[PDB]
Amino acid sequence: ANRTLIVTTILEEPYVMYRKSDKPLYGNDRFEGYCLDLLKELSNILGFIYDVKLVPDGKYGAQNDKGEWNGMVKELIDHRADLAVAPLTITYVREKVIDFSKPFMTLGISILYRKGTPIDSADDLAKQTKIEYGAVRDGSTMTFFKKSKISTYEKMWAFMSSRQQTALVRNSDEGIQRVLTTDYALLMESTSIEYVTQRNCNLTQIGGLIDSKGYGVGTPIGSPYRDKITIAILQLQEEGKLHMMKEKWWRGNGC
Numbered sequence: 001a002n003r004t005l006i007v008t009t010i011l012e013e014p015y016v017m018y019r020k021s022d023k024p025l026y027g028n029d030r031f032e033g034y035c036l037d038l039l040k041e042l043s044n045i046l047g048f049i050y051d052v053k054l055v056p057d058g059k060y061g062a063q064n065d066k067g068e069w070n071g072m073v074k075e076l077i078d079h080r081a082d083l084a085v086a087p088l089t090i091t092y093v094r095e096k097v098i099d100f101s102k103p104f105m106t107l108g109i110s111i112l113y114r115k116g117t118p119i120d121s122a123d124d125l126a127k128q129t130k131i132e133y134g135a136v137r138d139g140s141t142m143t144f145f146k147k148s149k150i151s152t153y154e155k156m157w158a159f160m161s162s163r164q165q166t167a168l169v170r171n172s173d174e175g176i177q178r179v180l181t182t183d184y185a186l187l188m189e190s191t192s193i194e195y196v197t198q199r200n201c202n203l204t205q206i207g208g209l210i211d212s213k214g215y216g217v218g219t220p221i222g223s224p225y226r227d228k229i230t231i232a233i234l235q236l237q238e239e240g241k242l243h244m245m246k247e248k249w250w251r252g253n254g255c
């Protein structure tokens, strides 16, 4: 009409999940989560309708050695989506190829590991080999270590990229499973660490935030919607709604 916006996203708890129901669920009704509530509110403010699709390869997006992007980032580059509404990290390398709204949530890389060990920081992980560590393949944390010029992070990258078949995981669910079943520490964004540690009293963040950043809504470069989505996010912040959405999905999870 009124064209239907195509939204690309990625299943990731509590941001985007399949809703569980006894009755059959069709289309957007199949999904729930922080990012779906946010999408609803954005569409309430900006007056659009949308069709939610998953990223075909189930990846956030990274650029390979040939310079090629994948994941949700590539979906925007190739104009197969109008918006990525996902816990999608705003980074300088991504900003060269796609546009981002202002952040709807802030976070930094930290460490997820079990409690009760002498590991207090990234340095404690870097100076040893017994405890394996790593990150989600082709996300921004993996890229942060790959591009880092800080020694300890450089040393950590050499370790994870040499052990990449085991050290790099396909998604955060696998990384948490590795932390649970095996001797492994996950480099993970702090908002997700928070979600996990609230649900398993054996797990903890180790050390503080290794960087500081945000999740934003992605659009193709030059999109007219990017600024409009910023304005809508600023209204939700002003209304306290970003706070209530976070509380809803983190502490009192679900509907």
Ligand SMILES: N[C@@H](CCC(=O)O)C(=O)O
Pocket: 060, 061, 087, 088, 089, 090, 135, 136, 138, 139, 140, 141, 142, 187, 188, 189
């Ligand atoms: N939010 C990250 C994914 C998770 C991670 O890389 O730690 C991204 O946009 O790539």
